[PDB]
Amino acid sequence: GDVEKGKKIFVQKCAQCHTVEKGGKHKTGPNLHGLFGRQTGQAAGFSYTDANKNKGITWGEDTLMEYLENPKKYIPGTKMIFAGIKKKGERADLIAYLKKATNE
Ligand code: HEC
């Protein structure tokens, strides 16, 4: 994926609810640092729905590709109010950005 294109997507569609940096604040949504290779619902200090807390999957490229297409379909009951990114290539670019920015 294209990290620069992914950053733009993140800024436009995600940043208002999410920070990525280590120690970043929670906003409407949880800070995302450390997301890759961890189960759903594990950001310290964030109050998740039971739906996100108990989804029982590990985040990675494949599960983020599915989730970001349509969050409510993957996690019914989620309080992330976002319809999804419909284009597969845009999801891949965003995910490549996230794999860098949430791991720095
Ligand atoms: C505010 C309106 C949001 C927007 C825009 C985005 N997200 Fe979000 N996200 C939000 C909330 C409130 C939550 C918790 C939902 C719950 O039911 O408890 C989330 C959750 C996620 C997660 C899961 C995190 C985890 O399990 O630890 C991910 C991976 C995620 N959000 C990513 C993400 C992306 C990449 C966004 C832009 C496309 C995006 N979110 C937008 C709130 C909001």
Side-chain angles (χ1 to χ4, degrees):
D2 183 314
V3 165
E4 175 180 30
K5 293 183 164 83
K7 180 175 176 176
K8 183 173 182 282
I9 297 162
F10 182 86
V11 168
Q12 292 187 171
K13 295 198 167 171
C14 317
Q16 62 161 298
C17 295
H18 289 284
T19 62
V20 292
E21 73 277 23
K22 185 191 216 104
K25 64 175 190 153
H26 303 306
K27 299 213 285 186
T28 298
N31 174 266
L32 298 173
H33 188 274
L35 182 80
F36 281 78
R38 181 175 85 189
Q39 285 270 114
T40 36
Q42 297 284 33
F46 186 82
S47 182
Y48 289 91
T49 60
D50 275 10
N52 196 153
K53 202 54 145 193
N54 300 320
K55 173 63 183 182
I57 62 91
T58 291
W59 288 124
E61 296 175 322
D62 293 346
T63 53
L64 288 165
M65 290 286 286
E66 193 181 334
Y67 175 62
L68 293 174
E69 186 179 10
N70 188 340
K72 70 180 81 71
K73 178 193 196 165
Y74 193 64
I75 306 185
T78 182
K79 69 179 173 182
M80 178 166 139
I81 310 307
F82 180 73
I85 292 156
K86 295 331 183 291
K87 291 200 168 170
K88 192 189 176 192
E90 293 180 1
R91 289 193 303 277
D93 292 344
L94 173 58
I95 290 165
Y97 170 71
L98 291 173
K99 202 170 191 301
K100 288 286 181 243
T102 69
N103 283 310
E104 277 187 334

